[PDB]
Amino acid sequence: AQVRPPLPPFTRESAIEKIRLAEDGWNSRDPERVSLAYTLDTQWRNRAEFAHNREEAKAFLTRKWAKELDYRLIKELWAFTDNRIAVRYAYEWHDDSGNWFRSYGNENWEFDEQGLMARRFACINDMPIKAQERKFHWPLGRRPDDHPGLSELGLE
Amino acid sequence: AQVRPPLPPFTRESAIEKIRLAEDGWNSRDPERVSLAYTLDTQWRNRAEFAHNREEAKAFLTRKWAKELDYRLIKELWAFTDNRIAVRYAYEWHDDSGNWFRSYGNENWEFDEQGLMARRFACINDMPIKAQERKFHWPLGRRPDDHPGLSELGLEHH
Numbered sequence: 001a002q003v004r005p006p007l008p009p010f011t012r013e014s015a016i017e018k019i020r021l022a023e024d025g026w027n028s029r030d031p032e033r034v035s036l037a038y039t040l041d042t043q044w045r046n047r048a049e050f051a052h053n054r055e056e057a058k059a060f061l062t063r064k065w066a067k068e069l070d071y072r073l074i075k076e077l078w079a080f081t082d083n084r085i086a087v088r089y090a091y092e093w094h095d096d097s098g099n100w101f102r103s104y105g106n107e108n109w110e111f112d113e114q115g116l117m118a119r120r121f122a123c124i125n126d127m128p129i130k131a132q133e134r135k136f137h138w139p140l141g142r143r144p145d146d147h148p149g150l151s152e153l154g155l156e
Numbered sequence: 157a158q159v160r161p162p163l164p165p166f167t168r169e170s171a172i173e174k175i176r177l178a179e180d181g182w183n184s185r186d187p188e189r190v191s192l193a194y195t196l197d198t199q200w201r202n203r204a205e206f207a208h209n210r211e212e213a214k215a216f217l218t219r220k221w222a223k224e225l226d227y228r229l230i231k232e233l234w235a236f237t238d239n240r241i242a243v244r245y246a247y248e249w250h251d252d253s254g255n256w257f258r259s260y261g262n263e264n265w266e267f268d269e270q271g272l273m274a275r276r277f278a279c280i281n282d283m284p285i286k287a288q289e290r291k292f293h294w295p296l297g298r299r300p301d302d303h304p305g306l307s308e309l310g311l312e313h314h
Binding site: 043045047048050078079080081084085086088104105106107108121122123124125126127155156 | 201203236240244260275
């Protein structure tokens with residue numbers, strides 16, 4: 001890509017917007033679309049796996065959604081400083097077997113002047129849940145404007 | 157009636173200090189000592205496990221170090237805002253079957269006015285490593301001031 005606003009340094013509002021746009025992107029479960037938000041030579045650590053460029057990042061995303069079905073995500077701001085944002089998130093999905101999980105994650109982002117993400121450090125843990133325990137409800141895609149956020153679902 | 161500085165809101169400097177003190181605490185592998193840094197009604201989610209008070213947190217730590225042998229930790233600041241700190245970290249250890257691991261974590265902290273942590277959200281992933289891949293070698297306990305941090309060690313992968 002070339003430029004994707006908001007651009008750093010972030011303010012509380014622009015950081016929250018940056019996060020919402022990212023959330024919408026991942027809720028599309030489209031590797032190509034999602035990959036465009038990252039630098040060509042983006043550096044990633046997703047769990048115990050690493051990516052060293054946008055192409056490897058996209059490859060990971062393709063594997064990801066071939067595994068995590070009916071994926072629904074919610075991201076929320078934790079803290080931000082200059083060109084860095086710390087985000088908390090959770091997503092619900094079911095595997096090929098049909099069993100459900102809620103994944104809890106913390107991702108730390110760093111953006112270049114063009115608004116593209118140069119570094120992504122994400123740690124995620126999967127917790128099995130019963131189908132009736134799903135908390136995220138909305139048509140696959142962008143989370144509706146009025147759907148409660150991460151801290152409003154009593155996840156803690 | 158505890159008071160544990162640095163106190164919020166944090167500055168870059170005090171946030172780094174807060175993190176270093178926490179790292180020293182966990183590197184003691186002492187459940188009681190570490191538990192005192194959290195509020196009596198502290199709320200935690202560590203991986204897929206939850207704790208709802210200091211006692212439950214302490215019980216978790218007791219299980220943790222009975223399992224994660226020869227544990228060595230390094231924490232580093234990512235970002236901070238008001239009474240919240242976002243931390244990146246890694247710890248090396250081995251299980252009692254001889255398997256070594258390097259665990260990568262991202263933990264987000266929220267402190268009360270007295271510097272005690274009221275909320276802890278930690279996500280951690282484990283990468284199996286060979287003993288020869290170990291990067292942390294200091295005597296069990298506090299990391300020497302002369303020892304490189306996460307940034308000085310650089311990206312840690314096979």
